[PDB]
């Protein structure tokens, strides 16, 4: 599923992302836009053999199992495929774990390079929230 900007913001707000660990909603929408272009089915293979999955591009090296990332962990306890669903619940629940692990949203490379230090509130402006 390809989310609309406002549609996704309302979805994320409902799942408890707004201000989660101090990150305003706009930060999450910004990250999702640049990581996956709001596409739940986005996948991208990395040099190390791991793959990033879903709207928040969560990595198979640590977070989910895809059966093809040798010596990897499954800290979210889920198959990576579950991160590609039209329902973002699995991605949200797992992202909450990632952002709580000490490095905050810096774990998302696109957020650090394209959202951090910007007017991220602009991503939810005009939305009925």
The verdict on whether residue 101 carries a ligand-binding annotation is yes
Q: Among residues 104, 112, 114, 127, which is the contact residue for Cl ion, using CB under 5 A?
A: 104
Among Na ion, Cl ion, none, partner that 104 touches (CB below 5 to 8 angstroms by kind) = Cl ion
From the list 3, 14, 31, 9, the residue with the least C-alpha distance to 98 is 31
- Return left, alpha or beta for 81; rule: phi > 0 is left, psi -120 to 50 is alpha, else beta: alpha
Range 83-122, binding Na ion (CB under 5 A): none
Q: Contact at 8 Å (CB) between 56 and 17?
A: no
Among Cl ion, Na ion, none, partner that 91 touches (CB below 5 to 8 angstroms by kind) = none
Residue closer to Cl ion, measured from CB, 22 or 70: 22
Q: Among residues 60, 108, 111, 120, which is the contact residue for Na ion, using CB under 5 A?
A: 60
Q: Which entry of 52, 66, 87, 119 is annotated as an active-site residue? A: 52
Residues whose CB is less than 8 angstroms from the CB of residue 126 and which lie 6 or more positions away in sequence, other chains included: 6
Strand partners, 23: 20
CB of 3 to Cl ion, least distance (A): 25
Q: Contact at 8 Å (CB) between 83 and 91?
A: yes
- Residues with a catalytic annotation lie at 35, 52
* Footprint on this chain of Na ion (rule: CB under 5 A): 60, 65, 69, 72, 74
* Footprint on this chain of Cl ion (rule: CB under 5 A): 104
């Amino acid at each position: 599923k390809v989310f609309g900007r406002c549609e996704l913001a309302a979805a994320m707000k409902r799942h408890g992302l707004d201000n989660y660990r101090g990150y305003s909603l706009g930060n999450w929408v910004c990250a999702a836009k640049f990581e996956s272009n709001f596409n739940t089915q986005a996948t991208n293979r990395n040099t190390d053999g791991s793959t990033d999955y879903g709207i928040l591009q969560i990595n198979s090296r640590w977070w989910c199992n895809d059966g093809r990332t040798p010596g990897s962990r499954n800290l979210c306890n889920i198959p990576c495929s579950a991160l590609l669903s039209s329902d973002i619940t699995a991605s949200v629940n797992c992202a909450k774990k990632i952002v709580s692990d000490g490095n905050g949203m810096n774990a998302w490379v696109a957020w650090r390079n394209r959202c951090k230090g910007t007017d991220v509130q602009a991503w939810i402006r005009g939305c009925r929230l």
